[PDB]
Design a protein around this nucleic acid. Sequence first.
DNA 1: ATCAATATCCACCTGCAGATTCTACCAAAAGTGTATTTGGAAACTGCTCCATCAAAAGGCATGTTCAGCTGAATTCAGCTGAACATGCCTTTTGATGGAGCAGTTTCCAAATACACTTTTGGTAGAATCTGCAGGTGGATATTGAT
DNA 2: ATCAATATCCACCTGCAGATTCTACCAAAAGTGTATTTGGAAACTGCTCCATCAAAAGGCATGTTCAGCTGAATTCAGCTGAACATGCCTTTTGATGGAGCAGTTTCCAAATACACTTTTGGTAGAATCTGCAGGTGGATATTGAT
Lengths: 115, 108, 83, 87, 99, 99, 98, 116
Amino acid sequence: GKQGGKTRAKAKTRSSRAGLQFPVGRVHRLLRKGNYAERVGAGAPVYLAAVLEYLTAEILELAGNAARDNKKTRIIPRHLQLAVRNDEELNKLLGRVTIAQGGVLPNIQSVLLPK
Amino acid sequence: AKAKTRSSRAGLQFPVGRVHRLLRKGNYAERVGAGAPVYLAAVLEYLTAEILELAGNAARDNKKTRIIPRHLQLAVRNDEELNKLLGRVTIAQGGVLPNIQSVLLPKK
Amino acid sequence: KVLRDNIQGITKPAIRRLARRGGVKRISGLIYEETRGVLKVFLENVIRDAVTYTEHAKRKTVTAMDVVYALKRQGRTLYGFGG
Amino acid sequence: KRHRKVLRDNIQGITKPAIRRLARRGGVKRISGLIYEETRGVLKVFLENVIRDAVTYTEHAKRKTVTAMDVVYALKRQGRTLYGFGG
Amino acid sequence: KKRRKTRKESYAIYVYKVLKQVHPDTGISSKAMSIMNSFVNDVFERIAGEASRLAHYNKRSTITSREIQTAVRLLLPGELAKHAVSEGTKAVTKYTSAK
Amino acid sequence: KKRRKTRKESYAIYVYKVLKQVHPDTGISSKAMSIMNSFVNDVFERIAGEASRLAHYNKRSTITSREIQTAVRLLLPGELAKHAVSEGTKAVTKYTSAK
Amino acid sequence: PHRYRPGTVALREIRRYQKSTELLIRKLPFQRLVREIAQDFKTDLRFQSSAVMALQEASEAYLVALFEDTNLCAIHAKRVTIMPKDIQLARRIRGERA
Amino acid sequence: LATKAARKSAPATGGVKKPHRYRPGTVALREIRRYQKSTELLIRKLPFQRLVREIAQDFKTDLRFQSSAVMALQEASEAYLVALFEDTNLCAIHAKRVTIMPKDIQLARRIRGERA
DNA sequence: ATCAATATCCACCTGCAGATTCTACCAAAAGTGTATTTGGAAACTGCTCCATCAAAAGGCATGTTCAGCTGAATTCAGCTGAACATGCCTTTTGATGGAGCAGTTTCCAAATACACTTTTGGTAGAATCTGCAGGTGGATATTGAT
DNA sequence: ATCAATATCCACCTGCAGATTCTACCAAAAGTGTATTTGGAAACTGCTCCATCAAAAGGCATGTTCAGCTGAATTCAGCTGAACATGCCTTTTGATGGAGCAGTTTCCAAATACACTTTTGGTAGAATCTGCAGGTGGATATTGAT
Ligand SMILES: [Mn+2]
Ligand SMILES: [Mn+2]
Ligand SMILES: [Mn+2]
Ligand SMILES: [Mn+2]
Ligand SMILES: [Mn+2]
Ligand SMILES: [Mn+2]
């Protein structure tokens, strides 16, 4: 009954099916090899992939703006720091994370300014 | 052959057969070595003795037979190492250690 | 004296007792309201997670387990109500 | 003789001006003369802790070379997650 | 001698696709991409980790979209968690629509 | 007839056995036992978790006693760790040496 | 008449509460407060007796320590009287505000 | 010269004053503004690499280091120190001071849970 | 210094509340005995990447002088909290249905495991872009003396 | 409120480092298609563990009075910042030898995978006891007044 491994129809990626840019194939795979649970259902990777993609769009939209603000076109780490630290939620989510070469937000305590 | 558990062989009180069953079903890894649960069991037991020792002593100090939460707390926060090991751990019904900032004591 | 609010239920002498165990000797009049607010944020955060565990467990009752698991995530690990 | 120079007192490579710069980014306007030695001490400890774990990660892998991965893992342990070096 | 390769996967091309979607004319240094890559994996292990624990807490042996959903709720703050969930459900619903 | 079980494993009797070895004449509060148990679970989970990580880092499928050892070296403070290592090695050795 | 000086009774209260371990907030008010907050999260909820005791244990444990740190702040500022500034600073450095 | 106006008039341009100075603290603010804008590291790379090697060698001898393992440590090291200073600053300000002192550094860490 | 008021100890004493030892009942572990499998170590070896040398130059570090202004010390008042004496309103303390949390049995959707076929992302090597970092120079603020 | 003295912009410029661009190669992915296994939703049903009431109990809200503490105002010694001169040592561009990671093949020690047997820790009353928390008595140590 191996008459099926031939002509007509032809494949389609799972990211394609989900409507995603991120790798559903790869994500599902990483879930198995990380030993989280015995079994992993099909929807697991689809969801995780949607969430990861979504979050990266959020940081990139925010960072790209920082890029525009400083008249640059290529996002650099400082743009990522600025984006995160300026957003309450991203700041919370990455509150124990240090983005190398990002520096700090410029902020001087009021009582340090002159007369 | 007349069986005598793994614990018996490793010479400890803690359940080796159990630590093993737990590690497998823990989803920590694919396979688990014969010695890991034994090693781990030895460690768990040892630290258990450490605390009990110390808390047993606390009881005796308060002139008491039965060890209660306060005893475990006094034992722990009074030992540099166990305290660090449990720094983000709060023991129910343990209360705090007597300590008053000197700047607050009476003036004469 | 009848129509009460719940957070106001956490009374001044109670808060005063807490402070004392903490080693405080003199307390500003504004500490009570301040403290009530801290406690509210504390409870809100923890319960949000506990109830989230409850819901996932398809239960209509918050178990001590749910509370414990939520605390471990807060990095507030508690001994005495499970393991 | 083969090689090797003795490494000692390198804690002083943490120059007064380098620490003063750090404070500035930290938004500090004025500094007590006793801050430089305190900071050195604080840093020595920070480093010993990360290096200890990192090197522990190394010895475990049966290696003689400390990788960025080592450092990165040692830092996640301490709760200091670092992005940018192969996380 | 021999032909000795190496191979190390990344999310780079994917970060890039999305990058082009939000801001069509913007680029990203390799250092920044490295960071974006760290971020993704980080969040991944955080969510997968939550899911893992959630499953044992319930004597469940499979991690389904449902575990992922509450993992997301437990880990992501307010408005962000709200949006990730819509996207997640959205994707799953669409995926299962394939006969 | 009846028929209904549940079952709840707990480290309690091993704890008790140990208490009777250190302080043969010291008893223990029920709540105190609940704390000890949690404690053992906690340290169990923390140690296994670290050893889990060590294995992945090194692309290894199995957690052996070596993993337990370094996991311990990382998790426990100086002395506590020093002794826990020796106790560990002692148990495993004593196990192999005789069967 | 007899009358203890300001700060003396407070002192022995510290000594007493530090020695004991009993909870210090009244159980029912706390019960009510927990339930009130939870309703915002999901309606018609029952609370295991042990769930509530746990939350109370954790909360007080939390507050007591915050009062420790708070004290250090006040003292740092050459005071003896803890004020809101002190709780705030401590929460900032603790990471709950900063 | 014997003519009308010019006679030993040495004190004509008296508006030209002597030197110049920024008041204490002005430069300190300039620097804050400066470093808060950048992301470059602030500890000299070689000296730092040496301190790392010294410490490491004192935990385990005969050891090697990826150039990046060292950079990773530097990145983490300063990120940590910079944040420590933000807190320290806050403590000093709490004492109604402007000069950070060890006393502040120690209070920051005590509260943070590093030597509590 | 001399009481005079309270608070705080110590030694007993005794009841109940929550540890005990007691017996018997399984299912669930955990031990044992084969069988089939495989992770990962040893034994080479190819090939990044680290340590180390060299050598020239510029950016910093060191060390010093000088004094602005900051912390620290002293003092003193208003006024914010502490201590206090009890009635009263609410929080304890138990009994009493019934809502759910769980054991249990059933049955199919969904996950595996196995084996080909096939599409895709990682990379090694060269070729060509291209943001943008520094270098200027000069227009535009921001200090600080007076 | 000026002016002088520096720092700070801010757009223009372009040479190089580092993105972005194909060529192709290939291996591990990832996908497609039968067959076999099983985890858990789903319906019930019993049995705890809750939420509700009542009476019975012990802390809190109150308002007065004054001690004491927090700030405010004043002063002044000196630390710490600004600036300047000088000389080192970090930073940079290159290049080499070789330690030591990182591939690849190849086995055997150890580990998974059933199956069968034995045992044991958890559980449900059922009776037995015992450590010790509140209570008493009375001595004595603090605390605050005069
Ligand atoms: Mn000049
Ligand atoms: Mn007995
Ligand atoms: Mn007067
Ligand atoms: Mn009375
Ligand atoms: Mn008077
Ligand atoms: Mn010099």
